[PDB]
C-alpha cells in the first residue's frame, strides 16, 4: 500500500 | 471526459518596444551597436508578447512555452528596471476571463500601467491553457494521463501563486476573474482534475481496490471542497459547479464500490451489500440530478449487477447482516498531487534577454 503509491508517484516525475 | 477547463484572458495589442528603448538611451549614454545590443532585446520581447497573447489559436505545448517564456522574461525584468518609481509608463490591457459584461457597459476589462498587472494576467493564461491541454488529454492512453497530471498540477499552482502574489502586485482592485477567491476555487478544481488523473491511472494500470478507493475518496474532497465554494457564487461558467457537484458523488461511489470489491474479497458480504447501496443511492442521485452533465450509465450498471450478485447470494448462503451506513469504517484518502510551485525560469530552456544588465 505505502510502496504502491510510491510507485505512483514516480509515475508523474 | 467531462473536464474543466479556463478560457484565456484577452488583451490588447502593446507596442512594448518603443517605451522601453527609450528608456535605455538615457541611463546608458551611447552612440549605438554596444547598447543597441539591448535595444534589439525590447524588440523581440515586444514580438514575445505578441506571440504569447495576441493570438490565441492553438492548445499545443508550443503555444504553452510560449506562454511560460513570456512570463519568465517579465519577471526577471522588473528587478533590472527600477519600475517601483514612476517612469516607462506602459498599460496593460485585459479582459475578464468569465464576465461577458453586457450591453449597457460593454465589456469587463481593466487598463494597469504595471508590469505586476500584466505578469498576473499572462500567468493566469499559462494555467488557463495549461487546464485546457490537460482537459484534451485521451485518459485511455497512459502518455495522455501523465501530460494531464502534469498539467492539471501546474495550473492549480499557478492560480494558486496569483492568489497569493496578486494583491500587492496591483495598485486597484483586479477583476474578479484574477481576484484571490476566483483562482483560490480554480486551484482547487485542477488540485480535483489532477487527483482525478491520478484515480483514473491506477483504474487503469489494475491496482489494489484498496488503493483505488483511497485515492478516489480523496478526489471526492477536492471536489467537495470546490464545490462548496462554488456554491453561493456565480463567478465561473453555469457548468462548473453542476459538474464539480457531480464528480463529488462519483467519486464518492468509486470509492465505494472499489471499497466494496475490497469487502468482498474479505468475505465482508453485508459490507459488500452495504457499500454498494451507498454507491448505486450516489449514482443515482447523479444520474437524476446532473444528468445533462455526465453518463453514468455504464457505473451504474456495474455497480447494479454487483449488487444483484451480491445480495442474491447473501440472502440465499451467507446471511450476513447488512451494516448501516453509519457502523462502516471511513474509507482512507490518498493524496499523489500538490499545486505546483511557480519558480521562474517556469519555461525550459529559458534565456534571459536583458540577463547582461
Known amino acids: 500500500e505505502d510502496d504502491d503509491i510510491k510507485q505512483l508517484a514516480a509515475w508523474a516525475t | 471526459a467531462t473536464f474543466i477547463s479556463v478560457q484565456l484572458k484577452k488583451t490588447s495589442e502593446v507596442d512594448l518596444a518603443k517605451p522601453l528603448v527609450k528608456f535605455i538611451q538615457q541611463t546608458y549614454p551611447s552612440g549605438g551597436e554596444e547598447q543597441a545590443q539591448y535595444c534589439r532585446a525590447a524588440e523581440e520581447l515586444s514580438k514575445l508578447r505578441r506571440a504569447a497573447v495576441g493570438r490565441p489559436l492553438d492548445k499545443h505545448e508550443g503555444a504553452l512555452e510560449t506562454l511560460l517564456r513570456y512570463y519568465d522574461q517579465i519577471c526577471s525584468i522588473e528587478p533590472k528596471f527600477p519600475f517601483s518609481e514612476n517612469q516607462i509608463c506602459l498599460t496593460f490591457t485585459w479582459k475578464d476571463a468569465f464576465d461577458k459584461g453586457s450591453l449597457f457597459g460593454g465589456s469587463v476589462k481593466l487598463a494597469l500601467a504595471s ?29 495522455g494521463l501523465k501530460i494531464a497530471a502534469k498539467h492539471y498540477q501546474f495550473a492549480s499552482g499557478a492560480f494558486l501563486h496569483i492568489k497569493e502574489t496578486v494583491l500587492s502586485a496591483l495598485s486597484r482592485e483586479p477583476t474578479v476573474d484574477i481576484s484571490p477567491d476566483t483562482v483560490g476555487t480554480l486551484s482547487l478544481i485542477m488540485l480535483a482534475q489532477a487527483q482525478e488523473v491520478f484515480f483514473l491511472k491506477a483504474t487503469r494500470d489494475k491496482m489494489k481496490d484498496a488503493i483505488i478507493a483511497k485515492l478516489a475518496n480523496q478526489a471526492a474532497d477536492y471536489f467537495g471542497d470546490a464545490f462548496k465554494q462554488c456554491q453561493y457564487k456565480d463567478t465561473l461558467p453555469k457548468e462548473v459547479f453542476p459538474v464539480l457537484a457531480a464528480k463529488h458523488c462519483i467519486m464518492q461511489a468509486n470509492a465505494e464500490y472499489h471499497q466494496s470489491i475490497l469487502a468482498k474479497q474479505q468475505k465482508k458480504f453485508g459490507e459488500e451489500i452495504a457499500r454498494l447501496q451507498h454507491a448505486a ?14 453518463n453514468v450509465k455504464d457505473f451504474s450498471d456495474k455497480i447494479n449487477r454487483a449488487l444483484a ?8 448462503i451467507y446471511h450476513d447482516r447488512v451494516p448501516d451506513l453509519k457502523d462502516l469504517d ?14 521562474v525560469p517556469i519555461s525550459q530552456k529559458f534565456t534571459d534577454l536583458f540577463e547582461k544588465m
Not at chain 2, 443511492?281 to 455526465?294: C, F, G, M, Q
Not at chain 2, 450478485?309 to 440465499?316: L, S, T, V, Y
Request: proline share 3%.
Open chain 2, 115 to 143: 508590469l505586476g498587472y500584466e505578469k498576473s494576467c499572462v500567468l493566469f493564461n499559462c494555467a488557463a491553457l495549461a487546464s485546457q491541454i490537460a482537459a484534451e488529454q485521451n485518459l485511455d492512453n497512459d502518455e
Open chain 2, 309 to 316: 450478485a451480491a445480495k442474491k447470494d447473501n440472502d440465499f
Open chain 2, 330 to 343: 471511513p474509507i482512507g484518502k490518498a493524496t499523489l498531487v500538490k499545486s505546483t510551485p511557480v519558480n
Open chain 2, 281 to 294: 443511492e450516489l449514482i443515482k442521485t447523479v444520474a437524476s440530478r446532473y444528468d445533462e452533465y455526465v
